[PDB]
């Protein structure tokens, strides 16, 4: 019995222990193992496996024993015995990820290596003790050594993917080692050369690049790592050489955003690329415009706009996700504001694309199936951190002029009355940003009587001034002044 495996380890006959561990490995390698008899009668097995993990095990049966380690690490109620200091020492020593034993190991094949990698990510996903002990032990310098040692090592997708996934878990949990990798090791530089190796598959590079699934998911996970590390207090942190490195990441993302991932990973690929594109230095952002003229190119105002049109298409494709908006729609909108605000052909192009579909002049400013109508309906959503994003978007795309803003938006007073201090004074001024006072169509006829916060229906005729004033009718101040 697999219950009797823990008793067979007590006698410790090598064939019995190894064969029972082998068959238990191929049986229970799946997620969510045994249900009743494991929290009382496999924690003993967990204790004895931690004890035999403490000594260095023999050169054979390693995959089997470490697979049992991984399998018992899949359960929840054995991490307390598998997440100690010396157990983490043994698992890192077999993992070759600790700096305590770096010039030691004779050249290991990748199989036991990736198995130990899997045990490490299984523990570090769900042990805060392992979070503390990883921040204590500083595995990330040897992890950075491994991720830097790729152009000469032929390490495949499984080992590669899995140890940078371990990096993603540690950088998701520990902000101290986040900033430690940020400053102390130039993780953006090492991640950019990792991104160059992922893109270097050469997928008919002169037409649109087409990344296959393995390297696609590697690029997706290293973009998770990049977004994990790139956000922290970077908003106005400008340097020339660091801005050049950020610009190299920007032009690499420019070449990457117009791609298509294999299988069905293209949407999540695009979302992670724009997530990485979001929090960069905005002065370094406008290199998204820096695209040449080409055959098959949406040339507007003499300049290319193909990647901006593509990410606008991504925005319209992404908007339909109604269960989780603030993940999916915020960073594209913010980066579209910043690239629109730093470039007059960008501002003029999007101001000529999304705004000047006017509504039918009668009906309300929120009904209609157009994208402008979608953004109008989105601006009153109860998420403040998408409503301010869309408000800033329509303001900076409306050429920073409030009478243009009210001339198609009725709630824009409630939008921008707090964005600036009321907006009815000198602030967000008259446009030196081209901006001439002539936007026109056959519209504004009804806006010659522009009853503005509503669409302007002229049916306001109940007067009701029956006698005098305030007679039980506007003497409601007597309950008001306390308020």
């Amino acid at each position, epitope marked *: 019995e697999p219950r009797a495996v823990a008793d067979a380890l007590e006698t410790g006959e090598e064939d019995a222990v190894t064969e029972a561990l082998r068959s238990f490995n191929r049986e229970h390698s799946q997620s969510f193992t045994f249900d009743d008899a494991q929290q009382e009668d496999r924690k003993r097995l967990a204790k004895l496996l931690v004890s035999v993990l403490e000594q260095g095990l023999s050169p054979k049966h390693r995959v089997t024993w470490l697979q049992t380690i991984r399998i018992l690490s899949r359960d929840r109620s054995c991490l307390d015995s598998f997440a100690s200091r010396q157990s983490l020492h043994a698992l890192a020593c077999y993992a070759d990820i600790a700096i305590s034993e770096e010039p030691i190991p004779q050249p290991p094949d990748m199989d036991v290596l990736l198995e130990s990698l899997k045990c490490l990510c299984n523990l570090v996903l769900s042990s805060p003790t392992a979070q503390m002990l990883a921040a204590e032990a500083r595995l990330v310098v040897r992890l950075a050594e491994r991720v830097g040692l790729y152009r000469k090592r032929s390490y495949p997708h499984e080992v590669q993917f899995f140890d940078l996934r371990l990096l993603f878990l540690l950088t998701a949990l520990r902000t101290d080692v986040r900033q430690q990798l940020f400053q102390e090791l130039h993780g953006v530089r090492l991640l950019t050369d990792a991104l160059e190796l992922t893109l270097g598959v050469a997928p008919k590079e002169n037409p649109l690049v087409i990344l296959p699934a393995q390297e696609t998911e590697r690029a997706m996970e290293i973009l998770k790592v990049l977004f994990n590390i790139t956000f922290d207090s970077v908003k106005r942190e400008v340097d020339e050489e660091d801005a050049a490195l950020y610009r190299y990441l920007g032009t690499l993302l420019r070449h990457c955003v117009m791609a298509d991932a294999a299988g069905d990973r293209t949407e999540e690929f695009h979302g992670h690329t724009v997530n990485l594109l979001g929090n960069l230095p905005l002065k370094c952002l406008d290199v998204l415009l820096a695209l040449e003229l080409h*055959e*098959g190119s*949406l040339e*507007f105002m003499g300049v290319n706009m193909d990647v901006i*049109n*593509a990410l*606008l*298409a991504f925005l*319209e494709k992404r908007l339909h996700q109604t269960h989780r908006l603030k993940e999916c729609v915020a960073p594209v909108l913010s980066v579209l504001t910043e690239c629109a605000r730093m470039h007059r052909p960008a501002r003029k192009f999007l101001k*000529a*694309q*999304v705004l*000047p*579909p006017l509504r039918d002049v009668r009906t309300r400013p929120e009904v209609g199936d157009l*994208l402008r109508n979608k953004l109008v309906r989105l601006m009153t959503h109860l998420d403040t951190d998408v409503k301010r994003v869309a408000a800033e978007f329509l303001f900076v795309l409306c050429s920073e002029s409030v009478p243009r803003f009210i001339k198609y938006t009725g709630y824009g007073n409630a939008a921008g009355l707090l964005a600036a201090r009321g907006l009815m004074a000198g602030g967000r001024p008259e446009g030196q940003y081209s901006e001439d006072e002539d936007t026109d169509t056959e519209e504004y006829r009804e806006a010659k009587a522009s009853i503005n916060p509503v669409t302007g229906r002229v049916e306001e005729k109940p007067p009701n001034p029956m006698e005098g004033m305030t007679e039980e009718q506007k003497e409601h101040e007597a309950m008001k002044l306390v308020n």
Partner: nanobody
Amino acid sequence: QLQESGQAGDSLRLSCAASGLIVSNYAMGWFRQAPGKEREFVAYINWNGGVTYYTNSVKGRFTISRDNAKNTVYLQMNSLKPEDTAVYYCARTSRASVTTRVADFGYWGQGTQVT
């Protein structure tokens, strides 16, 4: 419910319209479809005639305008070639992007074929 009428390299007018009782104030779209071949996008004209788009072998001789008030598009098939014998569905997308090669919008018309 769209419809439009229709020996050397010649100039030929093709005044497609919204005259099939069609609302079209969105961006229109032209499509070739040869016998045996599937639909072939050739022309993207936004409203106000601002942006323009052609594929790699139609750009220099098959210019296309848009009287956006009447919601009509006037196509100037200049210098006719042996790649003319395709049926032509006027169409109109419902998105907000210059979207090529996918038939993601109906209103596919009846389709005309030049002789």
